[PDB]
Structure 1
Amino acid sequence: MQFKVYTYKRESRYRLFVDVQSDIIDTPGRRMVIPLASARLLSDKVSRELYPVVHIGDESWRMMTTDMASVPVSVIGEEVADLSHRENDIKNAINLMFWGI
C-alpha cells in the first residue's frame, strides 16, 4: 500500500522498503518500492532531496530512491510503518530522479 513500509522477505543488504506505487494502479502481484538503508550507512554529503531521511520510531533510514524496484507480493512481509506524512519529500525524490530539477 502506497507509503507503507514493509519488510523484505529475502536474503539481502536491505531489510525494509516503502511501497511508492499509486493505490489506483493495480499490477496484480507486484508493487514498485524504494528500499531503505540505515541512515548511518551514508554521510550527509548525500542529497536528502534525492535520498530522503525518514524515521521509524527512533531509528533513521535513507530512502535509496535510485535503487528502487518492483517486487513480487511474495517477498513482502509485515508492515512496520506508514510514511504518508512524507508524501511531499517522497514525491519530490522520485520526480527528481526522472525529471531532474
Structure 2
Amino acid sequence: SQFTLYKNKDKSSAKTYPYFVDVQSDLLDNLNTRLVIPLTPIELLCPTIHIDEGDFIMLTQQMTSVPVKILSEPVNELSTFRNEIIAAIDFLITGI
C-alpha cells in the first residue's frame, strides 16, 4: 500500500537494503509486482530519513519493481514523508 514501509524478505539483499518504501498507486496493487524505493542504513534525490526502524538513505535513484512476495507485512507508515517522496521521484524524472 502506498507509502508503507516493508521489510525486504530477500535475505541476500536485505543486509544492504533492509526495507522498501512502497510508492505504487493503491489502485494497482493487485499486480504481482510493486514499485518501491529501497532504504539503506546510513552506516553503509536521496534524503536521509529517521524512522522508528532506524536511520536510512532513501535511495530514489535505485527505485525498482519487486515481486510482491518479497514484501513483509506492513512494518510502518511513511505517508508522513509522501510529499518528500513524490518530490524526489519528480526530481529523478524531471530534474526539477
TM-score, normalized by length of structure 1?
A: 0.83
Judged with a 3 Å threshold, the aligned counterparts in structure 2 of structure 1 residues 64 and 40 are, in CA distance, closer, same or farther, namely: same
> 1:26, 1:76 → 2: CA distance?
12
**Alignment correspondent of 1:32:** 35
Query: 1 or 2, which has the higher helix percentage?
Result: 2
Q: Does 1:14 align with 2:9?
A: no
Q: Deviations over 1:56-101 (max 9, x none)?
A: 2172111000111111111111322111011111010000000111
Alpha-carbon RMSD across the aligned residues, in angstroms, is: 1.5
TM-score, normalized by length of structure 2?
A: 0.87
Structure 1 unaligned segments of length 5 or more: list them: 42-49
Q: CA deviation at 1:6?
A: 0.3
Q: Percent identity?
A: 44
**Alignment correspondent of 2:49:** 54
Structure 2 unaligned segments of length 5 or more: list them: none
